[PDB]
Amino acid sequence: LDRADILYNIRQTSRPDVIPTQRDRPVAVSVSLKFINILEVNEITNEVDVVFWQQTTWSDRTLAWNSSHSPDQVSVPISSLWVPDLAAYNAISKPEVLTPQLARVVSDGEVLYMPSIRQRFSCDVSGVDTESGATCRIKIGSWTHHSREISVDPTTENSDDSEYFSQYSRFEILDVTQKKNSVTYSCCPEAYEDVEVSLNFRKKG
Amino acid sequence: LDRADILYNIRQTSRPDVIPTQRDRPVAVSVSLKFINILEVNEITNEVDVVFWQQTTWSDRTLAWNSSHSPDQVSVPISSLWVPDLAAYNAISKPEVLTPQLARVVSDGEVLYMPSIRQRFSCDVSGVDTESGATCRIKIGSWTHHSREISVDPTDDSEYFSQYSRFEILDVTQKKNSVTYSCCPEAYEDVEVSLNFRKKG
Amino acid sequence: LDRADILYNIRQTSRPDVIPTQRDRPVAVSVSLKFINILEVNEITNEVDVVFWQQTTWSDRTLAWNSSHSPDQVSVPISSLWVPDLAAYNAISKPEVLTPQLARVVSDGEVLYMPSIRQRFSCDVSGVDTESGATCRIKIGSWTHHSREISVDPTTDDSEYFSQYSRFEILDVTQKKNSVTYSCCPEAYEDVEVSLNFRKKG
Amino acid sequence: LDRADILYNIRQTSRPDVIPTQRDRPVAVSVSLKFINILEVNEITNEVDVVFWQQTTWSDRTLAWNSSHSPDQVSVPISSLWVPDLAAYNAISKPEVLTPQLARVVSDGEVLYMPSIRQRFSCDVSGVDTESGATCRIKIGSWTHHSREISVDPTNSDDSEYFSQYSRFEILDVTQKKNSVTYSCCPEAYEDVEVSLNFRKKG
Amino acid sequence: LDRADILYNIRQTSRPDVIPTQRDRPVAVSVSLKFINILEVNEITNEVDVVFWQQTTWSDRTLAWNSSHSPDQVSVPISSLWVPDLAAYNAISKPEVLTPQLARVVSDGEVLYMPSIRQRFSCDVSGVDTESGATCRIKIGSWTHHSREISVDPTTENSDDSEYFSQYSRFEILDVTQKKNSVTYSCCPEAYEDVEVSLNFRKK
């Protein structure tokens, strides 16, 4: 197999509308926000514009191929793949996807999708101008799939919070923490999982 | 049947352009707005920006399947389904759909579509900065289907409302209407959602 | 025939790119603007934002079906139908179509398309804050079809649908049909001019 | 042939991606801007918003049909035709096309496309508020086709006839100049038309 | 072959989704920014709006044809070609592509794609109002392809930095420099190449 064959096979057989659930267990989705910039903060209205990479991983065994004597990974347009229906609950604009919409697929079916996104959020901006800073909480989960179909978890790994954060922003990041939740909305009987990412930041002098 | 089969069958045979009317009785559509946020209020111009979940339910039996030994529900792209042609009459921007455009379909054909929407409205903003607050009325109905084809009916007020909004919700009420426009002989149904809100102190 | 059959037949056989001219006669298009709101008026720049229903009717016999023991009307996506190439000459933004893009088709081929549109216009805003108000003239006609292919006519209570919450009020709406020759081309092109007389309220 | 047949044949056989070059000669494109309005002028930033009809003509013989006992002209969606890849070099927004995207095609293959366009430009706004006015130069040419593939020429005419009487501005004069430019990126010459719009604020 | 045949063949056999890697060697991509205009500078927020031609070249042999007695080049919609997944890392708006989206393809498979783009960036705007000006660094590389699949290099050319820059801008260009980098991100084990274009400019 070469890349052309792999991509052809994926395109011809991939079912972008079918959740790759296996043996009726939930698809385990990992989500991690890598903050790149903070723009347009407004303490009066409690709104903020953020740019972040939304690192998203999951497994879809239907994409798998035998990689002996073949490429181990390819880049695939997300239009040809099933993608988790994640949404930020407190976003007040739709995601502006800044980057090419390609996911990376490994021969065992592991998928990585990591777009850079600019989005405006409603959250707690109070104290952005103090030492202790503001703490903006971003809530992300599957819009339509309950806990038996999609589980959402923060990425297990440690990292430099500001690793990719712009040195030219008027703001700086003090801390990022994550919390997993499972919520029952009065609309539906099942539980829906989400990750809450708490961004602690302040204005630089 | 597995999910793949169900979704394949729906895709291959769904008529997104065909209203699932049965025996010429109207498709009964339920509409309910779950308010998430109020931004950008303007008492001078009587305009307001709102974020809300537009909970929409209806039945389409052409989607039904035998669910013994099969999944009972699936998520389906709305591009593969007929969806009611609802519009907010007093909206002054087109709906900005914030969420993935998927509906939930049950094996008996019951459909739920609940996108989060940001939209600007023309309505009564007067009194927003007072104790009794403003009351903004949002009118939603089928744009082109009369009452014999589509009926619209209303389904805690702040359950999902952002605690970080500059505004707070005092009350939400709903009223069903049936209106005859001078352009057309038939009646058209709508739901009027009255949002009573004020600026927080 | 049920609705599914009718819609299937229309989709399979409709030619959205073909003007439904019959026997060399122009397609008779009716146009009427139902004003819903007036927002963002600017007397300095002579620009105004308007929301209106653009009621558009015409006949396309190719859509017709025998309706005894069948539905008499269906809603059809405009992407499946020929639609008149109308434009507002003095619009300075492209139409923002607010509503689902569906037309109503009757079994004899009569079509109604009535989207709610928000659009900005260049026009005479002077006097908007006076008793007699401003008179904004909106000119609408076929962009590319001359008078032998498309005729345009005004439709044989002005505030009926106008928002009571607008900062403005409508004093009067009048309509005039015109036939104009542009230097770019030898044939005449029809338009309807809708004159909206409005003023700022107390 | 009726219109349905003509439009069907055009749709089925049109190669929107193929430049209708005939016999090693460049496709001759005519361009003319009919100014409708001038909005949002900014003398500090040298930027201006203009609305204009971009009258564009060329010949594509692959579209031709025998018109004896047939319509002589049809309106065709530009998605079904090859269209010149014109761009305004000094535009700072993408064209906002205001009108239905249809071209007029004559039975001999002559094409006319004339959309109304709103676009923002970077140009010389100085003096806009004086008697002699400002002169904004708009440069339009094929983005990717050199002079052996596309030639561009201005269409003696009043490019001002359609200008809004309700604009805050007025047009004093419009002139055109044809250029042939070599860019350091590429060895060939690329043609453009420069339209100079002389205008001022009304007093 | 005429142009119609060439374009037909390209459309029918082109795999826009397949990186034209040849024999386990990265696709060599050249990138060069031709600055056209600088608008909307903000020294408080360190943001700037720039208009530039993003000159991008690479080779795709699957596009090649025998050009004896045939046209040597054609213009091709990029929707029919593989195109490098380049992104500007410090962009804060998506690229507004101003020009027709066509690439130029030579009979040997060389491709040139050069759209004019308007985009807003986060970068160092300080000193823009001084003699020495500001230096805004723009970082461009493949979003998803590591160094064994795509290499990125500045264009070998020497150039006049202001050749196409608008005389009507409120700003002027003092200097443009380029640096190639190879970076390892903590998300992945491989290295990703980028070009950093440093734009030294000031208010007139």
Ligand SMILES: CCOc1cc(N2CCCNCC2)cnc1Br
């Ligand atoms: C039956 C659940 O289907 C749903 C749920 C939701 N929401 C409630 C569950 C959590 N996600 C927010 C919206 C939206 N659309 C459809 Br469709």
Ligand SMILES: CCOc1cc(N2CCCNCC2)cnc1Br
């Ligand atoms: C026959 C009615 O068809 C209609 C009606 C309407 N409206 C009048 C009925 C209620 N909805 C507002 C628009 C718009 N487009 C078409 Br098409």
Ligand SMILES: CCOc1cc(N2CCCNCC2)cnc1Br
């Ligand atoms: C046959 C004329 O073809 C035309 C005419 C116009 N206009 C002149 C005729 C009246 N309508 C305004 C635009 C625009 N595009 C094409 Br294509």
Ligand SMILES: CCOc1cc(N2CCCNCC2)cnc1Br
């Ligand atoms: C054959 C060169 O191909 C080009 C040239 C240019 N430009 C230089 C030639 C004149 N047009 C401006 C852009 C842009 N894209 C491609 Br692709």
Ligand SMILES: CCOc1cc(N2CCCNCC2)cnc1Br
């Ligand atoms: C193999 C890694 O897959 C990736 C990596 C990245 N990035 C990390 C490498 C450098 N480019 C920035 C994003 C984005 N999407 C996918 Br998919």
Ligand SMILES: *[C@@H]1O[C@H](CO)[C@@H](O)[C@H](O)[C@H]1NC(C)=O
């Ligand atoms: C190209 O085709 C021409 C025939 O016109 C011939 O001269 C030559 O052999 C061909 N070149 C290759 C490498 O096939």
